[PDB]
Amino acid sequence: MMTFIVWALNKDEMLKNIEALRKAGAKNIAVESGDFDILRAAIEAGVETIVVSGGGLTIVFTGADRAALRRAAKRLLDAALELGAVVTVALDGDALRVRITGVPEQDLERLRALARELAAEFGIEVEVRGGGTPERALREIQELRELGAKNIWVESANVDWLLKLLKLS
Amino acid sequence: MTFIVWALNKDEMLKNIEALRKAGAKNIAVESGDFDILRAAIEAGVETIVVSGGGLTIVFTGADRAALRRAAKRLLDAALELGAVVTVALDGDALRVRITGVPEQDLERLRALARELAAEFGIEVEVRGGGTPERALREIQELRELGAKNIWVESANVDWLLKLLKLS
Numbered sequence A: 001m002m003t004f005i006v007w008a009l010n011k012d013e014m015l016k017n018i019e020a021l022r023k024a025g026a027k028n029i030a031v032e033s034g035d036f037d038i039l040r041a042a043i044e045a046g047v048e049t050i051v052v053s054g055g056g057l058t059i060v061f062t063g064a065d066r067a068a069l070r071r072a073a074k075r076l077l078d079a080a081l082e083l084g085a086v087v088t089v090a091l092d093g094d095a096l097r098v099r100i101t102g103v104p105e106q107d108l109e110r111l112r113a114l115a116r117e118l119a120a121e122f123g124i125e126v127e128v129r130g131g132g133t134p135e136r137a138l139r140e141i142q143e144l145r146e147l148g149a150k151n152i153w154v155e156s157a158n159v160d161w162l163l164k165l166l167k168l169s
Numbered sequence B: 001m002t003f004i005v006w007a008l009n010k011d012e013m014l015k016n017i018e019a020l021r022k023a024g025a026k027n028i029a030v031e032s033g034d035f036d037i038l039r040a041a042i043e044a045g046v047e048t049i050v051v052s053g054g055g056l057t058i059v060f061t062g063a064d065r066a067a068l069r070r071a072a073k074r075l076l077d078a079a080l081e082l083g084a085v086v087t088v089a090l091d092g093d094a095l096r097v098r099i100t101g102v103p104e105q106d107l108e109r110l111r112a113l114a115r116e117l118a119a120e121f122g123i124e125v126e127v128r129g130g131g132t133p134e135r136a137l138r139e140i141q142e143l144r145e146l147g148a149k150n151i152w153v154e155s156a157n158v159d160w161l162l163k164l165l166k167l168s
């Protein structure tokens, strides 16, 4: 037997995906996201196993020009990789989502500022739902439990973030 | 609570589980699309494994990090427009690119581009394919025999998970 983990950067894809696995008859369905809104939606749809992809930033560039989105993303990717980050990128409609993990809080504030600079240059909107601090994770994990999460797993490429949350838990 | 160590580097993975073990983590899992990393985790005594199913793992080697980043931007550009989910990590010597969420046609496009880029740049590439559910099932059985007790499977591509469910 196996647990099937749906990794989703958007709420609509995650619902569609868990619905497909439920129709297909998967016994053990989990949802993974750095977005606590998506993890809440999963639990409300009746998912009992949640993976918190914690730490770092989710930077979302929105605009009709996909060339401008990719250009901004490539620049951000370059800056993030130089600091030793793990970067996950997905182009979804008019939104380009960049997940950044494994850089210190001082470096994230730098990438926050850069994201604002790049947004102006290429004339696009940028929103940073980042945070991911171990303290915030500990708070939102309790909320997910109270919403009906039975199994909570936590994931990172950054062991220090796992060690900080281990310390707090 | 289970602590999942995401790894595309075998050495970093082993250092990371050691740190969590010393720190007092009771439930540790290792996640990777690289079956050799999952083998190394199980051989080190990890009993929970997340198989990151499907797509490609592309490893660029034999040039400076600045050059590896330029190659990464070229590959990302192609992958993003085909609608792929792309994870990129610059690791010491090598640049590792994980590509998922697209059919074989697009993977072949990116295999070819990675090879072209490697030649065009003058760098070495290791294009690790073999991301089909059929093989994943055979890899999963191998990992069980090596000593994995809990096997979790993960994808952004629900189609890949559905085909695995059918074949399982």
Ligand code: NA
Residues within 6 Å of the ligand: A040, A041, A044, A147
């Ligand atoms: Na809610």
Ligand code: NA
Residues within 6 Å of the ligand: A165, A166, A167, A168, A169
């Ligand atoms: Na603790």
Ligand code: NA
Residues within 6 Å of the ligand: B052, B053, B054, B055, B100, B101, B154, B155, B156, B157, B160
């Ligand atoms: Na996949």
Ligand SMILES: [Tb+3]
Residues within 6 Å of the ligand: A007, A032, A051, A155, B006, B031, B050, B154
């Ligand atoms: Tb994962």
